[PDB]
Amino acid sequence: PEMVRGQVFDVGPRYTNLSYIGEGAHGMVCSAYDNVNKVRVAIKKISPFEHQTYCQRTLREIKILLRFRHENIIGINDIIRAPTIEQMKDVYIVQDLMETDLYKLLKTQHLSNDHICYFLYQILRGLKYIHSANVLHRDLKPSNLLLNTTCDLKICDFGLARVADPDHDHTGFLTEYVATRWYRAPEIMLNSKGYTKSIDIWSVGCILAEMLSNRPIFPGKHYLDQLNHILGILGSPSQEDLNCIINLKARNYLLSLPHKNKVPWNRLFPNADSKALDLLDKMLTFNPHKRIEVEQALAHPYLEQYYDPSDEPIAEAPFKFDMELDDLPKEKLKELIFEETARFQPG
């Protein structure tokens, strides 16, 4: 086995000339040369069986990544582990190398309107495929959007994904939520568990705002600050929107806030393409039932130079089941992960 600034990283014969890329807490990531395909690749090391939540989201992610096949979603080229479940300590995930991501790019680069259009298009083309599989990403954000040097875009990090379940969405006021605060739809904080497709659309809207200005549009510092950031720009909800909120705690909280006026988008983004602000508006709609869908966003005039429904594929095999992974002993998790990764074992 071989070293990379510390821990073991033995990725076996096939992958050589390692180079650290950063322990980004979803393992330790290194680049390497794939001697069968003769391209440099990316390798992510997982050690999940020492805590169960790490295991369930490793399992969910692998099953999703393996069933999905789409230009705008990162795939898995290979999975390296021990040949027996007794010996399986670490799991290595091999993917196409991607030189950067939109988070790193946004810190340093002004995006032209053409780049914003093209990035937005590829996010939605990939998200169309995801939703057609009845899957919600739930953690869309710039660092989860990888780019190569020709600005090809691929969605990654399905660790928080679930099968959609719009019928069992409702919950109380201020119920805890895992996904990154800045991209949470307003209804997460009010009445939603995030089991609805419109959760991802809000997130993409936030990414679009961030592409126009290089700064997060709603940088909430704590759970409830996130809601007050949204309301400060969108303004106080309408009575019609408030009447859709039946939980009294959520509704009376909104009712208690002083009246705020909308901030016009062309004030926030006086440089922006007006067609882009129109689609931003429909994406950042307070009411989840009025928020635009992924397919209508693709048909929006801002994307018409790219729109092509015959070149925007949908999944063959939808997940018709949420994976019943929460009530599983750690031994079942480990074995299901072993079994899911057998496809890459020699033999």
Side-chain angles (χ1 to χ4, degrees):
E2 253 313 334
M3 200 264 298
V4 285
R5 313 193 161 163
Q7 203 34 223
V8 186
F9 211 94
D10 52 345
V11 301
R14 197 189 164 193
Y15 305 100
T16 36
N17 195 185
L18 274 274
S19 175
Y20 182 70
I21 301 200
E23 207 154 2
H26 72 330
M28 164 167 54
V29 195
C30 292
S31 79
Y33 187 72
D34 172 14
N35 291 105
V36 173
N37 283 3
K38 305 305 205 72
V39 303
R40 291 192 63 74
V41 301
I43 297 164
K44 195 162 58 233
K45 170 183 158 204
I46 309 190
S47 322
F49 322 100
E50 61 185 50
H51 202 222
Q52 184 160 350
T53 174
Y54 209 153
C55 261
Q56 284 159 348
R57 299 181 173 163
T58 300
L59 178 54
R60 183 140 43 218
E61 172 132 36
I62 278 160
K63 303 165 73 175
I64 292 162
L65 288 185
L66 286 186
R67 190 189 294 185
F68 283 6
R69 180 200 281 272
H70 191 281
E71 310 187 331
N72 302 112
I73 303 167
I74 199 79
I76 301 187
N77 308 349
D78 203 11
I79 298 168
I80 310 289
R81 40 82 151 163
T84 66
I85 190 152
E86 286 80 2
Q87 295 163 297
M88 172 174 68
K89 72 295 168 196
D90 294 276
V91 175
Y92 299 86
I93 289 173
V94 181
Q95 305 171 289
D96 304 340
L97 190 53
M98 300 292 275
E99 286 93 323
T100 185
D101 55 68
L102 183 66
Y103 175 93
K104 310 339 165 212
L105 204 67
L106 274 183
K107 293 322 187 63
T108 46
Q109 308 302 323
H110 169 259
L111 312 191
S112 83
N113 184 37
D114 287 342
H115 284 92
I116 294 176
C117 201
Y118 187 42
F119 294 172
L120 183 54
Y121 178 57
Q122 301 175 80
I123 294 160
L124 297 156
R125 186 172 180 261
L127 184 63
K128 175 177 173 211
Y129 182 95
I130 301 170
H131 284 189
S132 73
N134 210 37
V135 179
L136 320 170
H137 190 281
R138 288 165 93 245
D139 200 14
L140 295 179
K141 63 189 176 173
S143 58
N144 283 340
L145 301 174
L146 322 166
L147 296 308
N148 67 7
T149 52
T150 54
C151 289
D152 293 314
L153 189 149
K154 288 178 191 287
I155 304 170
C156 69
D157 192 2
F158 288 77
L160 282 206
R162 335 211 61 87
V163 165
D165 193 3
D167 300 343
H168 308 189
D169 195 45
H170 196 297
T171 187
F173 186 39
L174 296 173
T175 73
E176 305 106 60
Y177 203 66
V178 197
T180 318
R181 173 173 327 118
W182 293 353
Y183 307 83
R184 290 178 188 146
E187 67 274 11
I188 296 318
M189 292 69 90
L190 293 167
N191 65 1
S192 176
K193 310 202 215 176
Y195 291 173
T196 289
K197 276 169 191 182
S198 56
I199 284 321
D200 283 341
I201 297 294
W202 179 273
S203 277
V204 176
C206 296
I207 290 160
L208 172 67
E210 201 165 326
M211 285 201 285
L212 303 161
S213 72
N214 296 82
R215 328 265 184 162
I217 178 178
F218 308 123
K221 292 147 182 200
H222 50 260
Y223 186 106
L224 191 54
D225 198 42
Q226 193 57 35
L227 181 59
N228 308 137
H229 267 257
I230 295 161
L231 297 166
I233 285 172
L234 299 199
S236 307
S238 73
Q239 197 162 260
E240 197 209 327
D241 288 350
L242 271 170
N243 288 339
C244 282
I245 300 177
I246 208 50
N247 183 276
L248 272 162
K249 279 187 176 180
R251 179 183 290 188
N252 287 330
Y253 173 70
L254 294 174
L255 282 183
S256 73
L257 299 190
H259 175 207
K260 301 173 212 83
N261 287 308
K262 175 150 194 79
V263 188
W265 299 114
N266 36 286
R267 172 140 93 222
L268 276 180
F269 311 101
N271 254 344
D273 188 310
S274 79
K275 289 188 183 108
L277 299 188
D278 190 68
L279 173 54
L280 185 61
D281 182 73
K282 304 165 137 65
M283 281 180 170
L284 293 183
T285 284
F286 179 88
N287 190 310
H289 297 103
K290 305 180 176 163
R291 205 167 297 143
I292 177 168
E293 214 250 349
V294 65
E295 289 160 47
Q296 324 159 252
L298 282 161
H300 192 274
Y302 177 58
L303 300 163
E304 61 200 311
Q305 85 190 295
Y306 294 118
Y307 184 51
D308 181 11
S310 84
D311 191 34
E312 292 151 12
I314 60 168
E316 263 136 30
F319 283 83
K320 50 158 252 209
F321 62 96
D322 226 308
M323 305 146 249
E324 178 157 296
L325 306 187
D326 317 76
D327 270 290
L328 270 47
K330 66 214 79 195
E331 290 93 357
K332 285 323 153 203
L333 284 320
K334 194 178 180 187
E335 186 179 354
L336 291 173
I337 288 173
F338 188 90
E339 174 178 83
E340 276 293 322
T341 61
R343 164 194 334 192
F344 302 93
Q345 285 298 114

